[PDB]
Symmetry: D2
Subunit: 470 residues, 4 copies
């Protein structure tokens, strides 16, 4: 049962909009909206969206596996060894938010302060003492972006696994000699850094020039979560405010995906006339180029929606019905919708590129979609006795208690996969968890969970006190 199986299972259920049905439904962890900072929904005048992994949630592990297969084929195509073709995507290995260390070829799971929680070289999980040889302070300077790449998006899951596959392959293949910073193949030296760059270039290529979009579109049921409650929620948002789309994707792909998401034999509710997807939006903007979008952005362009091509020149005209924009900036949206930042709830999955930046640069309110949560919550609740035991051990300590703390930490983490929970390793929170807490005002496995809260719900979080205030 993947996280997308959980989401699609919930998507298949029709909305019971009886007020008591809603009240009962959103008590369950799975259908809840989680609150980091209080948010009065009555003050929200605009609802904004990203598309990929927000409105269009790609099914797991099928979509990662397709990305993986195409990336592999691209690398083989440019001259990587044929053995790569015998790799197969393994959803049990990667967790999102790992750091690739390009100097030593390791995947690292870190906390908010750069402290190492997990280190794997290929598929070899390196224990505490052996990590000190390369990381004397069990620490990395994560701002050293030439050396460290943080694999923070769901699109990075296939390359997270591929990097490990490649390091493993080259290490165990007799044709290469393993060196501290890469591999020697006679008079050729392949650094982990150049290998990483090839992978990164190949993923980019697959998305922008290769066949990933085409293969997705030719089998949308296989690859994309579909939920009849999507149109209903968007219609309800539009009754109390404005709705916009701001996506990095191009118009043609956006139109294919969105048409599929709205292709039901009815509109918002069963029995209603079907309406085109575009009618759900007061403003539609593609080719957004976030995160730059939240600063200077790029020039505002107009999409010719017949051809899918941009009209020539900068668009100087007003917001009108049926217009589709390309590029622009976050100010374009504010100014055309007559919104201030705090009037906007921006809904997306990119914890850095969208949520962090819209919050820091513009003061937008934020809703982070975390697809993996839909399954992480089942593990958290089913194995709560492991975490509870770990808590008790840390308490009792505060000798063989440490050994047992390590063992329980391991067993807990393995329930989530080889790289553990997205949010922690044992009692230590990940960088990703800290970023969610700091920059996502609200979060959930799906933004559909908003459907279960009344129009002007007050989402509440407790006031924060400093230690000397407590």
């Amino acid at each position: 049962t993947s996280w997308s199986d959980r989401l699609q299972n919930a998507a298949d259920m029709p909305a019971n909009m009886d007020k008591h049905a809603l009240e009962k439904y959103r008590r369950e962890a799975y259908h809840r909206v989680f609150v980091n900072r209080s948010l009065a929904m009555e003050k929200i005048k605009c609802f904004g969206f990203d598309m990929d992994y927000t409105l269009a949630v790609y099914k797991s592990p099928e979509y990662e596996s397709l990305g993986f297969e195409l990336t592999v084929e691209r690398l083989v195509s440019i001259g990587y060894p044929q053995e790569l073709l015998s790799f197969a995507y393994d959803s049990t290995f990667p967790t999102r938010g790992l750091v690739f260390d390009t100097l030593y070829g390791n995947l690292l799971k870190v906390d908010a302060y750069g402290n190492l929680l997990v280190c794997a070289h290929g598929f070899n999980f390196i224990r505490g003492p052996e990590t000190r040889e390369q990381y004397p302070n069990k620490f990395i300077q994560r701002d050293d972006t030439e050396r460290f790449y943080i694999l923070n998006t769901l699109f990075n899951l296939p390359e997270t696994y591929l990097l490990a596959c490649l390091v493993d392959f080259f290490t165990n293949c007799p044709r290469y000699t393993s060196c501290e910073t890469g591999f020697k193949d006679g008079d050729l030296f392949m650094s982990y850094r150049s290998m990483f760059q090839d992978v990164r270039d190949a993923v980019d290529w697959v998305h922008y020039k290769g066949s990933l979009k085409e293969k997705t579109v030719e089998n949308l049921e296989k690859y994309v979560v579909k939920d009849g409650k999507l149109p209903l929620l968007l219609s309800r948002m539009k009754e109390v405010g404005k709705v916009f789309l701001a996506t990095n994707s191009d118009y043609k792909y956006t139109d294919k995906i969105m048409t599929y998401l709205f292709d039901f034999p009815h509109g918002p509710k069963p029995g209603s006339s079907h309406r085109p997807w575009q009618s759900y939006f007061d403003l539609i903007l593609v080719d957004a180029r976030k995160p730059l979008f939240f600063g200077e952005g790029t020039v505002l362009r107009q999409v010719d929606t017949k051809t899918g091509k941009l009209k020539i020149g900068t668009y100087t005209g007003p917001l009108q019905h049926g217009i589709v924009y390309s590029g622009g900036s976050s100010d374009t949206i504010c100014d055309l919708l007559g919104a201030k930042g705090k009037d906007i709830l921006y809904i997306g999955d990119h914890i850095f590129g969208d949520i962090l930046k819209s919050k820091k640069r513009q003061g937008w309110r934020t809703f982070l979609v975390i697809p993996e949560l839909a399954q992480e919550l089942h593990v958290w609740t089913d194995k709560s006795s492991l975490f509870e035991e770990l808590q008790s051990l840390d308490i009792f300590l505060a000798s063989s208690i440490q050994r047992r703390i390590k063992k329980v930490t391991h067993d807990m983490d393995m329930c989530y996969g080889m790289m553990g929970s997205l949010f922690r390793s044992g009692s230590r929170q990940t960088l990703f968890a800290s970023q969610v807490m700091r920059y996502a005002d609200l979060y959930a496995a799906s933004f559909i969970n908003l459907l279960y809260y009344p129009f002007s719900y007050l989402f509440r979080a407790a006031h924060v006190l400093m230690p000397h205030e407590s």
Copy 2:
């Protein structure tokens, strides 16, 4: 009763090192060390210090008032109007961590997300609705460092007040016309930005070329907290680890100040031979140029301690007894003391330049000295009934309740001064508070509070859980 009066009052008391006396003493809020993240003192092998406002705590309001007077005299000297001489420093106005908005000439108190808590133009406190004219989203992008300057150090307190004095003066002086972005004096236009730059340049000048150091040194009792417990604590640190000084100050000033701090007719304890200040340190480094010190730094130089001048050339030799370094980097210290980052507790008052950067760039453990806490804690405890009432009102709301929330917020904040508490405005935490929580592992009004904890105390903070984990 200033914060420095509280600290000097505590400094006058001799240390009772009976273990039960210590236990009882550190229960009191005033003598406590506060914990943001757990820290096992047994793992600390090196103790590092800044000098200014850490070891050498300048008395308030006397030192701010001297800074202020000299800055004013410098501005008059370069052609500012004579009326500046009638300003007098007022400790009741400034709170540390305010933002000067150089576009509109306002002082702003902000939260961690750039939301406006307080806005004053000169001495006019601007209410919610009027702030929207200049700040439509009640928000500033604090990363816009060309526009916004954050007055985060205790050395910035005089200029915080001076900026307000100047805006007030120019606004109410008939010779000038008030404009949106500055003042017109016939064919001269003085922008708030250029005015700010003059102030900033003048403060710098007073410290580096003017008479501030000289006047401080000619009356150290007036200007500098002195505490016989300082040598005792440093001696105790040195029994379990190494001790170092890394200060931006030059050798001559450092020597004058440190000699005074250690000038008692005894060494660590009464009855012991007096020892020179330098004997308390395994490594002494001046001209550190933090924050750059925590990255590339500058070349390592050696101080000729007779002349106070640098020897010519880069120092390539070992750590030896009696050597004093200048410049270098944080790695110099680690490598010469044989320390990893997490072995080091770095003790300082600069929440950005030292504490934040040593934590993020190097993984050092951090102790933040917050001198104002020594008095903020007395206000917090004495007026706890106001905060408690505010908490109850926010709870009851969660109409005239809002009015009462505003009124109680005002009354609470005024107990701290016109710009309120360093740490909050009513129930909203400041940027400064959020930074302390995030980057200071431990904090206190004085690092002397460490004297009251046993050698290998385990400072404890509760594990953090995400909302979905709770």
Copy 3:
């Protein structure tokens, strides 16, 4: 008769290597090597080449016209109006080295000091007084590279004409309103800058992703000058020194073009066995990325010559027979050939990117190929009486003499085309001419002209004296 007609006519003649035949041949202007600075050929130990417009001289106007047609089709493909398809390339309009002013949409012919010699808006040639409205000092700051783009390569000839076509078209098409900085089409504004960027992007696209290479290769006789004397000269160079190729082109294209250039039923001389092109080179380097090549460059890679693909990794091995390199730097070449800069004569057509940079960054000796010279020399000699008259008029002046100076200047310049000579407008030298003089030690219409000078000829230029020395 184009310049390439002259070159191909000379290419069809077999080499008469009798010493007196050579002596007589190189007296003629057409077969001469011109000398800016003295160069002792005996000191040259290595001969280096670019490919495009150096070894592979593309026939005119056929190749420009193909570039033009494909660029137009690309612009129409992305949404430019259908009318573009009625443009036809006109070799009489463009001269190389014009500056496009992206602010006002003008093509400018300038001297070395940025003084305006010619200004055309579309096809309207703007006279002295009207140019002052936009250029008050009849001057541009050519270092302002955001505003001014210098069209310095032979590959830029089609876009030089296209830019003028487009400005003309948009100006005279009633659907658009002409503005100072571009064109208004209702709610779309197309700046000359964005229009220029589209053109530049389209040219790039045609070369890198479109069909230009494919169409060239499918008709090499139509598009590429071929000369049996090429192998003979290269063989002679190789008898006295080393020979290398350093080209920005990729291996597959290089191999196609070079195979054609050497496809004769003989080797260096008639009667000799044919040898593969690669055997003429001690070192072959593709994907050079000049001008960066002359500084840091990129990592050295090895080409797999069977597949045309790069081997994976950085190449760490020695120079060996049959190896083909990709990327690297100018130091790679020096170090592998055991050459110092002044031992190298580098032969190319790119007056900036190759000749200027190899001279300034490395001190290489330089030979600039200027294909247009092959016809400019015929005009210069045939219309020498116009220049001579202009000289006499400038002398006589040093009233209606000025009028006559303008008229004769016009008539002279029109012999070369609408944008005049590459090297001057009347008595005023172009920027291009000044750059040739300053950075090309030797120059000619073709490097084949070296065949007519003995092995160790001393190319002589007179010593330069300052005015006070004269």
Copy 4:
């Protein structure tokens, strides 16, 4: 007889303004204006000046020797060895425009292409073969500004000699060990780069914070050329155009120096009332910060001429009588004087910072003052038989002829000093000479030479032809 002795000798003569007297006078090389590009004086509407070494020509070697002595004393003051005090300035060593190579501690005389003409390590002149060890191609990349500093100003003459003194001293002092890149003094290493930086900092300090200005002003007759013809020429300029001053110096120093330059008991001519220096200028601008002045510049300020201090704020008012500006940009001047670039003849000594930049960035006409020319011309004419012989030898060659070419080159060069002529070494022109030719439209030992040409003289230079045009 120094160059300033020649200039002061010519300054002592009263102007004979009879037209035939002028005609005869300007035939002599010493009183001539030399022409690189033709310049019609009738088109000049504004005459602009720098002060230092243009209007105020500092006497040699006295002023260099004062600079030297103060720089030495500053270095000793910061801890350089006492032996420095035994150095004495030697005008026979330095020539202007040498390059200090900070890696190897050499002074280099180079041509326009970076080819080495002379290399000295301390006072050891390194011969051809030994220079190849450090300079394998007898070439430096002069754009590598971290490594190479070009000593292009007359203010750099003392440090040119001091650098050589220091390298010599450290090399021959047994306390230090000479290394490839500097000197070892036990556990201190002083790189040539750090030594160079100390020197450069000390020169700056002497000018800006030390006693150089004060000592100059207390003996202006000793230090500054004074010429009664200065006011006469400026008065004549003002009859046909506008006159301005744009100097990097501050107002107080400018006023002291200019008052001295105009302190005669008469105005422009004997018998006329004395007029203040400021009355000779339509616009006076100090604190210019050239070269930045020729781009964005700094804000325009107004000098309070009573106090010598800047008024507070940016000056927004018109040009008026008696106003003195500070900062600004070259556009300020153009706009306030109603001039286009080519209307301006800018007169200065800084071949880079003023002449080059005003020409390239703005298209100003340029007059370069080269004080040393006043004596270089006497050497050139007196030893013309050496140059003539060298010319004949280069011709005859074009064996022992080379030996004789080297010997004659040496003997010629030694007539100018140990570092030879500013303009050449034997038949090879220096970088400095090439820059003068390229960027100075006119040049002379003194701008006073303009007094000998009629109001609207046409300065003529021959048209330049390319080799293929000749």
